[PDB]
Design a protein around this ligand. Structure first.
Ligand SMILES: OC[C@H]1O[C@@H](O[C@H]2[C@H](O)[C@@H](O)[C@H](O[C@H]3[C@H](O)[C@@H](O)[C@H](O[C@H]4[C@H](O)[C@@H](O)[C@H](O[C@H]5[C@H](O)[C@@H](O)[C@H](O)O[C@@H]5CO)O[C@@H]4CO)O[C@@H]3CO)O[C@@H]2CO)[C@H](O)[C@@H](O)[C@@H]1O
Ligand SMILES: OC[C@H]1O[C@@H](O[C@H]2[C@H](O)[C@@H](O)[C@H](O)O[C@@H]2CO)[C@H](O)[C@@H](O)[C@@H]1O
Ligand SMILES: [Ca+2]
Ligand SMILES: [Ca+2]
Length: 633
């Protein structure tokens, strides 16, 4: 098997070597990748040595590219082994006795989401409608268990919060976001996924978030569907390589298909309400939205046996993955064991591609998404709401502090998947979607050829709304995106290169003159991104550059705590009204970057940091490998 030998393949190999080099500090003792090498870091995780299911999926992807280029699959197997061991909840995390006591006719109890954290805890409404869960019985029959095989999104890799006790550095399942659209990462109260009431207040942390007349010890986990989908995508790339090299990784393929099987929960409305008629309880698949939603979650009792499951009514274009959907529905190797799984995924594939098209702005950037639950409490939609299969348009799904579609990264991450899907399937429904998107992307990459540097969009601003979906793209004349600021986010730049590489390669077979022009532009833009990354942005640990974090003023962000509510963090930090992000995370003041931060805050400056995010370094490496494999020039 003659593997490509050019400088881009070598750049990958060099990056791979840096990421795996012990001196650089990317991995924990368990072999778990951190969110970032640097500890003082807040953006979705709120500590740099937390990690995410996202990081695990990127780890898988990185190792898959390495296996493609070298024929060594040991690293990929290792990545899956650590995933299954540490981020997919096991027996002690989600007790089988509770999971087996699930009632698919009563999946959960309704509670409203609210526009501000001060309105929490939210009261459980036991009389409110909840639909039927149509997946549970099939999954249980297929796998012979009621337990869920999906990754939880957030892991405290070295027990930094101390929820695992005073003398442990073993990983701990934790969660943060609980209090709705206005709870930023600066406004949360971190909690253990297993709330045994050892920490927090009288009822642990539970009564900060949910209102009930009594509280029992319990576990609760939350999936990030975009990460599990990336796991499927990565494992597919690994499998192509495996057939090329004659290596058997079938049991790992089986892991990914099992995960993809459970990932179908991301197709469903939060409380299984009918799609487009959301005051009504669903009776099965009528509550299927068929996109990758913001999460599914599941939980249950520790001291006694009971359980619940929810989907999410909210959908963001940035989470979608037509590549994963295609893998699960239209390849034989990755047909999941559940009888209906491939069909469901095929329906999701079609729906996802329609979704990208519906949200494509006049300029070409993809707009936010859509929800089956206005205000997260099934409020009536305003007259004139623009819709997609009955779901109302939302410029910033789920979160507005900041808007969840303000970040340009969603554009790259998500369109990379469309591009890879398009290269793999040549689905014509994606072509114009990609053409228009690529032009916009390329128009917003600003090269400084003399310096061998560049900028790409950092923050996006949206106005207007799409035309309601009727089956074909309209050009969406009244839906607009503006680039408000540019920057040097190199991980995103890597992803963008990846997307442009697949798009160009997919156009390579076209004889149309305009396609030949688009091919040249996308390919050249990708190559220039990679060349400038390599030439100008290398440092000892990988490829990185300083970024300014003005948002770090929110270290002093007030955190809402109900009047009369008192509690403590494991380290003794007092939790009461008047709390701040920092007051309940005092160990941050022990961080080596802290003096610089507090000095910056002292003189009202923004904080300068140079970060090596595992996903960012991985996207960059993978972009090198991708360009090096698709274009053997
Ligand atoms: O407790 C006893 C009682 O439980 C009943 O059920 C309740 C349960 O108590 C509640 O906890 C549960 O609540 C969920 C909320 O409704 C839901 O909004 C919330 O959503 C969060 C999610 O927790 C969080 O992980 C998530 O994170 C994302 C980040 O935003 C992203 O940046 C990142 O990339 O990805 C993650 C996604 O993985 O944000 C979302 C949304 O903001 O989750 C709560 C639980 O975790 O509701 C249950 C039913 O309503 C039970 O029914 C009774 O029987 C029992 O007595
Ligand atoms: O939440 C999506 C994505 O966010 C990533 O962080 C971004 C952040 O959204 C943006 O505001 C900041 O300026 O840039 C960072 C990183 O480039 C985060 O790294 C991911 O974990 C997360 O999936
Ligand atoms: Ca550890
Ligand atoms: Ca807020």
């Amino acid at each position: 098997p003659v593997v490509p030998n050019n400088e881009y393949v070598q750049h990958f190999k060099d990056m791979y070597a840096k990421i795996h080099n012990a001196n650089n500090g990317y991995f924990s003792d368990e072999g778990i990748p951190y969110h970032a090498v640097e500890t003082l870091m807040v953006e979705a995780p709120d500590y740099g040595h937390e990690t995410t299911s996202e990081a695990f999926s990127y780890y898988m992807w990185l190792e898959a590219m390495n296996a493609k280029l070298t024929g060594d699959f040991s690293g990929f197997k290792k990545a899956w082994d650590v995933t299954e061991k540490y981020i997919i909840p096991g027996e002690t995390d989600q007790p089988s006795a509770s999971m087996s006591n699930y009632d698919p006719n009563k999946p959960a109890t309704y509670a409203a989401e609210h526009p501000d954290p001060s309105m929490y805890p939210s009261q459980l409404q036991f009389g409110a409608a909840v639909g039927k869960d149509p997946l549970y019985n099939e999954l249980k029959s297929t796998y012979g268990t009621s337990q869920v095989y999906g990754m939880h999104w957030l892991l405290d890799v070295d027990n930094w919060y101390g929820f695992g006790g005073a003398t442990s550095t073993s990983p701990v399942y934790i969660n943060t976001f609980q209090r709705g659209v206005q709870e930023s990462c600066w406004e949360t109260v971190p909690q253990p996924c297993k709330d045994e009431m050892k920490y927090g207040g009288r009822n642990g942390f539970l009564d900060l978030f949910t209102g009930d007349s009594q509280y029992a010890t319990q576990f609760k986990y939350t999936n990030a569907p975009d990460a599990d989908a990336r796991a499927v995508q990565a494992t597919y790339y690994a499998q192509l390589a495996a057939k090329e090299w004659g290596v058997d990784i079938s049991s790992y393929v089986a892991k990914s298909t099992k995960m993809g099987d459970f990932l179908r929960y991301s197709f469903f409305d939060k409380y299984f309400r009918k799609v487009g008629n959301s005051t009504q309880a669903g009776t099965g698949y009528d509550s299927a939205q068929y996109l990758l939603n913001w999460y599914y979650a599941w939980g249950g009792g520790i001291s006694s046996n009971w359980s619940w499951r929810i989907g999410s009514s909210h959908n963001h274009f940035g989470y979608q993955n037509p590549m994963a959907a295609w893998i699960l529905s239209n390849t034989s190797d990755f047909k999941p064991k559940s009888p209906n799984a491939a069909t469901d995924w095929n329906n999701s594939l079609k729906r996802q591609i329609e979704f990208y098209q519906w949200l494509q702005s006049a300029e070409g950037g993809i707009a936010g998404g859509a929800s089956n639950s206005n205000g997260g409490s099934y409020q009536a939609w305003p007259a004139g709401t623009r819709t997609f299969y009955g779901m109302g348009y939302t410029p910033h799904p789920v979160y507005e502090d900041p808007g969840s579609n303000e970040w340009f990264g969603m554009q790259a991450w998500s369109m990379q998947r469309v591009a890879e899907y398009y290269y793999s399937s040549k689905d014509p429904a994606a072509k114009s979607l990609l053409d228009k998107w690529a032009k916009w992307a390329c128009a917003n990459v600003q090269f400084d050829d003399a310096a061998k540097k560049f900028k790409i969009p950092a923050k996006l601003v949206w106005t207007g709304q799409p035309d309601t979906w009727t089956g074909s793209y309209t050009g969406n004349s009244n839906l607009h995106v503006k680039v408000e600021a540019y920057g040097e986010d190199l991980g995103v730049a890597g992803s963008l290169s990846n997307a442009l590489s697949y798009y160009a390669k997919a156009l390579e077979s076209s004889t149309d003159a305009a396609d030949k022009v688009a091919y040249n532009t996308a390919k050249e833009t990708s190559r220039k991104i990679l060349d400038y990354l390599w030439a100008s942005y290398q440092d000892d640990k990988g490829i990185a550059v300083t970024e300014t974090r003005n948002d770090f003023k929110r270290f002093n962000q007030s955190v809402y705590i109900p009047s009369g509510w008192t509690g403590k963090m494991p380290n003794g930090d007092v939790i009461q009204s008047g709390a701040t992000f920092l007051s309940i995370r005092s160990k941050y003041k022990q961080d080596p970057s802290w003096p610089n931060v507090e000095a910056a805050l002292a003189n009202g400056t923004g904080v300068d940091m140079t970060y090596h995010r595992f996903w960012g370094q991985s996207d960059i490496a993978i972009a090198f490998g991708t360009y090096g494999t698709l274009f053997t020039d």
